[PDB]
Amino acid sequence: MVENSELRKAGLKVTLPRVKILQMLDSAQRHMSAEDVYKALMEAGEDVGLATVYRVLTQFEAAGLVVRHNFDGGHAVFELADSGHHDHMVCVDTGEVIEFMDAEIEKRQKEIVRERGFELVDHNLVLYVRKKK
Amino acid sequence: MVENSELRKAGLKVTLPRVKILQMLDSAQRHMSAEDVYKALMEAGEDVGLATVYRVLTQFEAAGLVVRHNFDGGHAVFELADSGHHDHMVCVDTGEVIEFMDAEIEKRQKEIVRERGFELVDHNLVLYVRKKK
Ligand SMILES: [Zn+2]
Ligand SMILES: [Zn+2]
Ligand SMILES: [Zn+2]
Ligand SMILES: [Zn+2]
Ligand SMILES: [Zn+2]
Ligand SMILES: [Zn+2]
Ligand SMILES: [Zn+2]
Ligand SMILES: [Zn+2]
């Protein structure tokens, strides 16, 4: 299965809890907390406890299958890494998260780093915003 | 420069017109027509004729630097390929194009193809829609 390959490529043994959580992440909320995953699983009548959900998502994060972000300061969001790249705009007053991808900034980041003798390994860009209105 | 590397990797000699058009594509309209690129260039007081803009965008398309799409049936849209992956929803009545990326569908496409003995080289998914309202 595709999930099995993803887990193996990530140096992680294939297990039922690991497969169900990855499937939950695949189907979307784009930015889910550990509780959102747990609640979705419980709705689906599954049998995975919250602590296990958090543990697995942390295993996925360390492995590179997911990225963990904290946009409102008070909770962690976990989202797949495999998906197309996206940086984020966060509405400070409401907590609304808006993904974006600007090719100009992406190429400028590469230029900045390369002209210094480096290679860009990863990056994080968050723009905190408020409606002009 | 980053543009130079992109052009060379694509087996395309570096030229002024090729560099300016790629820069126009980098800075955004996410889905520009040849005329949109030409008009943007003219606004920027540049000196690239429309036929040259179309030719270069077609050179970029063949090379894989851009993908050409025809969403409303009557005009070609050119967008970078390098950007994160995105499929599209198109509002049939207005022509509005909405990008989306669903990890569930992406993994299901891979599963469908792999279980048949193939490797997925590329794909195109367009969902034509109308507001339920
Ligand atoms: Zn929160
Ligand atoms: Zn970025
Ligand atoms: Zn995101
Ligand atoms: Zn720039
Ligand atoms: Zn048109
Ligand atoms: Zn797709
Ligand atoms: Zn697009
Ligand atoms: Zn599915």
Swiss-Prot record, chains A, B:
InterPro entries: FUR (IPR002481), Fur_C (IPR043135), WH-like_DNA-bd_sf (IPR036388), WH_DNA-bd_sf (IPR036390)
Residue ranges, annotated region (DNA-binding): 1-82
Gene Ontology cellular-component terms listed: cytosol; protein-DNA complex
Main location: cytoplasm
GO BP annotations, alphabetical order: negative regulation of DNA-templated transcription; negative regulation of siderophore biosynthetic process; siderophore biosynthetic process
Gene Ontology molecular function, alphabetical: DNA-binding transcription factor activity; DNA-binding transcription repressor activity; ferrous iron binding; transcription cis-regulatory region binding; zinc ion binding
Protein name, entry field: Ferric uptake regulation protein
Upper classification of the organism: Bacteria, Pseudomonadati, Pseudomonadota, Gammaproteobacteria, Pseudomonadales
